[PDB]
Amino acid sequence: QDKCKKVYENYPVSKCQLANQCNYDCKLDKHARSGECFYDEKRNLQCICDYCEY
């Protein structure tokens, strides 16, 4: 698979500064493995829920 992390759909960026938020939530709100706030070559942070990444 060319992907193993599902973006927490919407999710008000507001916070997105460190772990916890996306991490914890993903670790349960989406039965994921982990997560964190990330962006692309555009400057847009979102809560990424990781399914396969340690």
Domains (range + CATH), the chain: 2-54 (3.30.30.10)
Q: Is 47 buried (19+), middle (13-18) or exposed (0-12) by CB count in 10 A?
A: buried
Could you tell me the strand order of the sheet in which 34-38 lies?
A: 5-7, 46-50, 34-38
CA angle 48, 53, 54 (to 5 degrees): 125
Q: Is 33 within 8 Å of 53 (Cβ atoms)?
A: yes
C-alpha–C-alpha distance, residues 34 and 53, integer Å: 7
C-alpha–C-alpha distance, residues 23 and 25, integer Å: 6
Q: Which token pair is 21?
A: 């938020």
Which technique was the structure solved with, according to the deposited record? NMR
> What are the residues whose beta carbons fall under 8 Å from the beta carbon of 3, sequence distance 6 or more?
none
Q: Which token pair is 27?
A: 């670790």
- In three state form, how does the secondary structure of 3-31 look? CCEEECCCCCCCCCCCCCHHHHHHHHHCC
C-alpha–C-alpha distance, residues 30 and 43, integer Å: 25
